[PDB]
Design a protein around this ligand. Sequence first.
Ligand SMILES: CC1=C(/C=C/C(C)=C\C=C\C(C)=C\C=C\C=C(C)/C=C/C=C(C)/C=C/C2=C(C)CCCC2(C)C)C(C)(C)CCC1
Ligand code: SF4
Ligand code: SF4
Lengths: 147, 742, 81, 30, 61, 146, 142
Amino acid sequence: ELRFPRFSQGLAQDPTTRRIWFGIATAHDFESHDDITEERLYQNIFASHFGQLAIIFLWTSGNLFHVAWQGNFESWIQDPLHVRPIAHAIWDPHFGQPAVEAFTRGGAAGPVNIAYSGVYQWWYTIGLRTNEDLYTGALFLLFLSTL
Amino acid sequence: EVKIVVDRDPVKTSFEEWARPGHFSRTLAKGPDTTTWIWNLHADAHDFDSHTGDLEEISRKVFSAHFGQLSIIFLWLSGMYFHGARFSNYEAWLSDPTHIGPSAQVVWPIVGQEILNGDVGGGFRGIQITSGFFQLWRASGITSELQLYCTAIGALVFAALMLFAGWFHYHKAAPKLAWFQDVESMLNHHLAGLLGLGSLSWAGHQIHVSLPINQFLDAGVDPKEIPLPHEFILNRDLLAQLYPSFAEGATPFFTLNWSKYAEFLTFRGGLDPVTGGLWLTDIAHHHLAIAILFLIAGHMYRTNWGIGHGLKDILEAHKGPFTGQGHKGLYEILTTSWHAQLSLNLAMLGSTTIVVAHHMYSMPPYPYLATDYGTQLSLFTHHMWIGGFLIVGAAAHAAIFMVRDYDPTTRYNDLLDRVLRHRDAIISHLNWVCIFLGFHSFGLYIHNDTMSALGRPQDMFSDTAIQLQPIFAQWVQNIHATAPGVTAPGATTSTSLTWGGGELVAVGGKVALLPIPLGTADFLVHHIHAFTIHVTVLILLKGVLFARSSRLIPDKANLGFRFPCDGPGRGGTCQVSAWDHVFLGLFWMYNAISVVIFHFSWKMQSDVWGTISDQGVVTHITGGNFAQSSITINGWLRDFLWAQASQVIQSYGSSLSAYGLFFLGAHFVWAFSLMFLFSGRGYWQELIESIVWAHNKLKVAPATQPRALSIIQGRAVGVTHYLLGGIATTWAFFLARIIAVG
Amino acid sequence: MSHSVKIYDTCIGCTQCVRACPTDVLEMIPWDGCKAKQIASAPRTEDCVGCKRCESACPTDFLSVRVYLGPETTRSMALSY
Amino acid sequence: NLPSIFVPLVGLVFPAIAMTSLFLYVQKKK
Amino acid sequence: LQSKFFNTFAAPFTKRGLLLKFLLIGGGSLVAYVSASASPDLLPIKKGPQLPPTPGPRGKI
Amino acid sequence: SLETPVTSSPLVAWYLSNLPAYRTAVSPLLRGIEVGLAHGYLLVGPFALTGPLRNTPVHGQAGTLGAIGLVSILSVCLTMYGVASFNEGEPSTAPVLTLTGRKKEADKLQTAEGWSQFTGGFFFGGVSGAVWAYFLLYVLDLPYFF
Amino acid sequence: GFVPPQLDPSTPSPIFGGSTGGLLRKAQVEEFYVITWTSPKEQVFEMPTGGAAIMREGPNLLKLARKEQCLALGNRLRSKYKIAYQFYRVFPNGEVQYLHPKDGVYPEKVNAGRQGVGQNFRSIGKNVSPIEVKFTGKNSFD
Ligand SMILES: CC1=C(/C=C/C(C)=C\C=C\C(C)=C\C=C\C=C(C)/C=C/C=C(C)/C=C/C2=C(C)CCCC2(C)C)C(C)(C)CCC1
Ligand code: SF4
Ligand code: SF4
C-alpha cells in the first residue's frame, strides 16, 4: 500500500485530498476491500462484534462509576419526589460566578447537572441501596469489558 | 445625417399563428412529442435573441413589448384610482387624517369573510390598506371622488392608446435600424425632454393647484367649501389674498428680481409640524430647480446640427498609462447588444430604488405620512425588495451578454480584455475579504451570545462592556447638525431631523421623527450588512467573470449560457453555468434584504416610532431595548422575533385574521421549496415511469408522455417557491404586527 | 486506466462520440458489423476525463458505449494545480 | 480536584497528541 | 558573536523527534501543574458557589 | 503571467529579499531564531492587553505565558509539518533560480535537518521574545500605553 | 506505421501580455502541454483561460496546463480558420511526447493500423450480476 489506507490500493493512488475522506467512509466495509475472502470476512465480523460489546460495557461501567462518585442515589432514596437526580460534576474553566451559582442544585457542593437518563429508577427498582454496590458493579463491568 | 426612416407593414394582423403554438421556434412548432414541450414553450417565449440573428427585428419586438408593459402599468393605475373613487372612504379620511385608518378595499359577504371588512372608523368597513396612496392624493389636492373617477377614466384611455400604438408600430410602421441605433438624439431628448419638462410641469401643478388648497386645509376647513382648483387660477384674487408677491404677474421673474417670489419658492428645510411632512414650498423649489437642471443638461450631444458632442468622441480620448488604450470602441459594444444595456440599466435602477427606499423614511415628503406607521414601513421594505431583484437581474443579463454576444474579433475592447486577463486575482481577493468580514462580523455575535450565556456580561460587546464605537457615523451626524450654521446659511434647520441635532416632530399624540443615536449594535449590524453584500457581489461577479471559460471546463461558453452541468466527470461538474451562479446568488440577496429589513423594523420601533405624552414623555412602541438586546441572537429570538410575533398569531377571529392565515401558507410553501431544491431527477423519472405503467394498464396512458421536470427547471421552481415563502412570511409578519400595535 | 470505457456491438458506426470526445480518447477502426464498416475504440483511456458527453450522444437502443467509473488520478480529475 | 488534573488533559494535550499522531500516520509514504 | 550564543543555548533543541518528545511532555506536565495549582482569585471555578441556590419548580424536584 | 508594480519593483523585491526567510547567505537555524524572536515580540501585545484576566494585576504574566504556550504549539506544528513533508536524505525543493537566472545552491533551509534547525531556532526565539516583551512591558514601562 | 512524429521545436510564441491563466506548480513539477500550429495571417483569437491575443506568421508555440484546454483551442482553430495543428506533452526530465493525431489523420475518420483496445462483442444487456463475479478481481464489463 505504501501509505494509508491499508485496505484499498485504488485509493492510495489519489493525490487529491478526497483520499482521506474515502479513507474513512470505506474502512468498516469489507466487500470493497482488496484481497478479501469469505472466511476472512466472517472472522472480521466476529472481531468487530467483540469490539462493539467492549465499547458498550465500558459505557455502562462509566455510567455506574460516575453516579457512584458524584451522584445522589444514596440520599435520593430518602425522598425520590423532592430531590432531583445528579449526573456528574461540572468542571468548566469558561464559567463566570453566576454560572457556578445557577448550577449547584439538588444539594451538591458544586456545579452539577440533573441526570435525566432514568438510571436511578432502574438501579433502585432492582433494589440497590449503597454506593459500594455501584462500585462493585462498575468493577465487574470494567473487568468484563477487558475480557 | 439622422432622419425619420421607417418601414411599412412587415407582419399582417392575422390570427393564423395563434392556433399554432411555438411558431417562433422551429423545433417547438413541430409538436409536443412529450410533456417537456409545454415547459420549453413558455421557457423561451420572450427569448427574442434566440429567434433571429439580426438586431433590427428583435429591436422592433422589444419596442412593442415596452408598449405592452406600459399598457399594463396604466391599467393598474386606473384600477387603483377607480377603487379609490367608488370604494373608499377618502372624503371621511380627508375630514381628519389623525386617527382614521385608510381603507380602500371591501369584500363581498358570501363565505363568512364579512369579518374582513373590519372597523376602520369614519362609518366605513373595509380591508385596511398600507399602499400609502392617501398621502399622495392629499398632496395633490384631489379632495373629491369626481377627480379620482375622471382620472381613472383618463388612465384607461391612455392604456388603450398605448396598446394601439404598440400594435401599430410593430405591425404597420416598423422603425428601422438607423433610428434605434441612433442614441445621441435619444439621450438629448430623454435628458431635456422627458425628465426636465416633467418636473417642470409638475412644479406647475403644485404651485398653481396644490400649494393653496393644502395651505387652506392646514388652516382647517371642510373641503366641501374649499375653492376648486381652476377657480384659483382663473380669478387671481384668491392667490392674491394668499401671497402678495404672487399678485405681480410675471414682472419680478423676467426683470431678474426673483427674490419677490421668496414666499412660495424657498429653502427652509426640515419638516412641517402641522403635518410632519415637507414644506411644499421646498419640494416645489426642488422640482423646479431639477427641471431647469435637466433642461440645461439635455443639450450635450451633436444630433443633426454642428454643435454638441458625440458619444464616440468622448470615450476614446480617455486612455491612461496603466490601462493603455482606454475605452476605445466600447461605444460599439454598448450599441450592438441589448443584453448589455439591460444589465447596465437594471443595475442603476436597482441602486436608485434602494436609495429611494432609504431617502423616503428619513425625509417624509408627503403630508401625514410619518405618522401612518404601517405605510412608511411597508413602502420602505417594498422598495428595498424591488431594488434587490433588479440588481440580481442586472448581474444575470450581464453574464448572458458575456456568453453570447461578446467577441474580440469585431466587438473588441482593451479595457474589458485587461479585466478578464486577471479575473483570478479579483475573485481571490474578494473571497478573502468575504471570509474576513464574515468572521469579524458574525463571530462577534457568537462571542457575545456565548459570553452572555456563561454569566460573564462584563466581557460582552456593548456600551456597558468592552466597547466598539461607530465614531465616523456620529462624526458625520454632528457635521450635518452643525452645517446649517455656517456652510449652508440659506437653510433654516438640518436637511432632515434624523441628524443628531434639534427637536422632535409629533402630531396627534404620536411622534414622527427625532434625532437617532448610534450604539455598538448599529456598528455590528452595519458590518453584517457589509459582509452579506460583499458575499452576494462575490457570487454574482464570479459568475459573470467565469461565464466564458473557467480553469475547470476549458470551453464553457460553447456549451451555452443555461445548461445543467457537464456530467459527473473529473470529480463532478454540477452547477457551472452562470445561470446557476445567479440561482445561488438569489438566496444570498434574499438573506441580505431580510436581515436589513428586520434591522430597520427593530431600530424604528425601538428608537423613533411611538407615542408622546401630554407632558412630553416618550414611550416608544417597543420600549427602547435595541442597544441592549440586538447584540445576542438569542435576544433577537426573545426580544424581537418571538415577542413581536404575537399580533399575527392571536389574529384569528378579528379583522386582521387574513394576515394570520398567510403566516402559515407563507411558511408552508417555504417548506415545499426544499422538496425541489434537495432531490434530483432520475428518482422522479423512475417514479413517473411506474405511474405511467399503472395508468397504461387501464388504457389511459396519455400521448403527452409524462416527464419529470428538467434539472434547470427543477432548480428554478425550487428557488421561486423559496423566495415566495420567505417574502410572504415577512410580509404577513410585518403587516399584522405593525397594523395591530400601531 | 483510471476510468474505463466499454463499447458494444450495437455500435452503428455513426461517429458522434469521437467528434464530441473532449480530450482525444476514442477513435474508429475498420469493422464488418455495420454499413459504415467501422466501430469505436478506446486506446487512450488514460486521458479519459470522465464526462458522459460521449455516451450522451450515442443514439442507439439503450447505449453502445459505456463509461464505467473507477479510481482517481491527477489527469482524470481535470487538475491544473 | 482530580477533574482539574484530568479534564485539561483529555481536552487539550491528549487530543493534541492523538491528532498529531494521526496526522503523521495519514501523511506516511513507504 | 551572537551566533555562538544562539547555537549553544539552543543546541540540544535541534534533533526533531527529541524535540517533539520534549515539547509534548513539557506542555502536558506544565498545563497539568498550572491547572492543579490554579489560584481561585483568577479562576471562578476553583471555588464553589458559596451561596444558597434556588429550588426548582414543584417544590424542589 | 502578469507583472504589476506590486509583484515586480525594485523596492519590493529588495525588501522581500532582505528579510530572513530568503537571505540564503545565513545559516537556516539563525533565520529560524530570528523569525522566532520576531513573532515572540509580536504576539505578546493583544494576548496580554485583551486577555480574560486584563482587569487583574496578574494579566502580564498571564498574557506572556499564553503567548509562550501558543509559540510552543506552533513550533510543534512546524516540526510536524517538517517530518510530514521532508524526507531525511532526499533533495531540496527550494527555488534554486533567482530573477536573473543564477543557478542557486539548494537552500539547506529547505531540508529535513535544516527544517529541524529552523523549528528549534523558532521555538527558542519565540520564548526569548515573549520573555523580553514581558521584561520591557512590566519593569521599564513608562513611554508606552497599556 | 509511416506516421512519424515531428519533434516539437522551439519556435516563437503568440503575442500576449501574460496573465493569471498560465502555468502553476503542477506544470513545474509533474507535467504540462505545448500546442503548435502554423498560422496563415496575424489575427485575433481568445485563449482558453482568459482574454484574447494575436498570433504571428509561420509556426506558433503555446504552452498550457492540461490537455483538455489544448484540444479545445485546437478544435476552435480547426472550426474557425481551417488549419491543422499538433500538441505535445513534456516531462521535467526533458522528454517530449506526441499525442493527438498518432497518424496525422484525425481520429474522426477511419485509418487502418489502429488496434482494437477495449472492445466487447456483445450487447449491453448481456452483462452479468456482481454476485457471479464477487470476491474476484474481474468485473462485469470485463
Ligand atoms: C381547496 C382545494 C383543495 C386544497 C387546497 C389547499 C390545501 C391549499 C393549501 C395551500 C397552502 C397550504 C398554502 C398556500 C399558500 C399560498 C400563498 C402563500 C400564496 C401567496 C400568493 C401571493 C400572490 C403572494 C404575493 C406577494 C406577497 C405576499 C409577497 C411578495 C409580494 C406579493 C404581492 C407578490 C383540495 C386539494 C382539497 C381540492 C382542490 C381545492
Ligand atoms: S469520458 Fe466520455 S467524453 Fe470524456 S473523454 Fe472519455 S469518452 Fe470522451
Ligand atoms: S456509440 Fe454511438 S457514437 Fe460511439 S460509435 Fe457506437 S454509434 Fe458511433
